[PDB]
Amino acid sequence: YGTQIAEITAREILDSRGRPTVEAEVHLEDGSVGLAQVPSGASTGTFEAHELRDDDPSRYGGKGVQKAVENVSAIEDALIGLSALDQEGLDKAMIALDGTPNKKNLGANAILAVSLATAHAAATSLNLPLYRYLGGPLANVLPVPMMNVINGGAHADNNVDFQEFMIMPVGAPSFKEALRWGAEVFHALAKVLKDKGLATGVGDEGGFAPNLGSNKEALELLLTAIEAAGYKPGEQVALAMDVASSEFYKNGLYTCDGVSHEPAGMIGILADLVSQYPIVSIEDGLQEDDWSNWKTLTQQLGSTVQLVGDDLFVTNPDRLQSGIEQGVGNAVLIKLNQIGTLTETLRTIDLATRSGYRSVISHRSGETEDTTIADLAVATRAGQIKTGSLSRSERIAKYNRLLRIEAALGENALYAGAIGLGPK
């Protein structure tokens, strides 16, 4: 009786950008409480779960989530009495209650909040940490963090075309050391920016967006930072990029460093960059619908560098399955609130894993104090996590959770970067 759902509550809280989002609280008959918060999503997109916004222009600029919060009342009616242990039954019950493919009815934000809060409730009921609850006794791999430090494209006011430049401490012996390497490189980077008179205000993810002139300037900055912190680029701290090519793709052409390129040109740009720079991963190097050219990119660089689909796959098992069939990418970003249940997320990670694709567990721009993605990364042995820079506690709280997990695993703790489960 004890694991049966007794109560499900939701309220409107704020994310890390000061915008409404949903949290849910699940009480079991044995007194177990699970609390989960949902990050910022999208209300739009063919292959993405739709979060429900109120669109009331006189509240929170129409970004209220009173309707999603009210819909949790209808989920409570449907789920009261079910075992919290039956995650798949619970998730299927909410999918059917919603009855729409993109969860437009109840809201993805309502459904995911209950989906995670149930899982937290159930792990507390069994007195298991969430990573062990979800992953069983081999859930022992700390991910290589891909750590935001420089922003461009739509995430900046500068002449950098690519969206995110990241460091990855691939060479560290432990997550605890990997995190310290990240932080020291981030503080060395701050000092270099100050010394060059560049702005050191941070953006959504806790990284810098100084007024730089090119993608090259960004990569050169990260190399200076790594070396000033005393680490070896590539061997110890490698580079990664979110190209978000969709942002600068118009009519079969990609505009990059003032010039227009055909797919074959953009591919060549990416190939020159991985030649010149210790880049171990590239996300959305080509546009979300440029599949024939994605196939060439994968054929050419796929065995030498990670090729992450984000907008390419939108955590959608049909798009990922198509990618797998066509030799497109070798890695996929996993966003819980892009698909909308824990079950469907785990199915999508399993599909990636079985096909030799790497799963990169990802934050959203609008994050919360929730640390679920840390446990999700360890549960699935994903080997990588993307949860922002080395400032802002909606980013830092995931690393602190990973430190607690690594300590608790003790002598069983493995670091992905040391056992071949990293990007390279």
CA-CA distance, 322 to 313, in Å (whole number)? 9
Whole-Å CA distances, 228 to 18, 46, 188, 278, 391: 35, 45, 6, 16, 19
Does the annotation list 242 as a binding residue? Answer: yes
The span from the CA of 143 to the CA of 249, in Å, is: 32
Q: Which stretch binds a copy of itself (CB under 8 A): 41-49, 250-258, 331-339, 362-370?
A: 362-370
Q: Which residues, numbered 10-29, are part of the site for a copy of itself (CB under 8 A)?
A: 11-19, 23
Q: Mind spelling out the 3-state secondary structure of 393-421?
A: HHHHHHHHHHHHHHHHHHHHCEEHHHHCC
Q: Which of residues 262-291 bind a copy of itself (CB under 8 A)?
A: none
**Residue 258 found at the interface with a copy of itself (CB under 8 A):** no
Site string for a copy of itself, 199-228 (x = CB under 8 A): xxxxx--x-xx-------------------
Total residues at interface with a copy of itself (CB under 8 A): 75
- Provide, rounded to whole angstroms, the least separation between the CB of residue 356 and a copy of itself: 5
User: Quick one: tokens of 383?
Assistant: 């080997």
Residue 369 labeled ligand binder: no
Nearest approach, Cβ of residue 164 and Ca ion (Å): 7
Distance, in Å, from the CA atom of 52 to the CA atom of 56, rounded to the nearest integer, reads 12
Catalytic hit among 76, 205, 247, 288: 205
Which listed range, 86-94, 97-105, 199-207, 237-245, lies at the site for Ca ion (CB under 5 A)? Answer: 237-245
In angstroms, what CA-CA distances link 366 with 22, 111, 159, 267, 316?
Answer: 12, 18, 24, 31, 20
Q: Which stretch binds a copy of itself (CB under 8 A): 57-65, 98-106, 158-166, 257-265?
A: 57-65
Distance in Å, CB of 370 to a copy of itself, minimum: 9
Is 73 a binder of a copy of itself (CB under 8 A)?
no
Residue 288 appears among annotated catalytic residues: no
Beta bridge partners of 359: 332, 383
Residues after which a C–N gap over 2.5 Å breaks the chain: none
Q: Is 272 helix (H, G, I), strand (E, B) or coil?
A: helix
Site for Ca ion in 282-341 (CB under 5 A): 310
Q: Which of 15, 98, 242, 370 binds Ca ion (CB under 5 A)?
A: 242
User: Contact between 196 and a copy of itself (CB under 8 A)?
Assistant: no
- H or E element that contains 296: helix 291-301
> 335 an active-site residue?
yes
Minimum CB–partner distance for residue 269 and a copy of itself (Å): 28
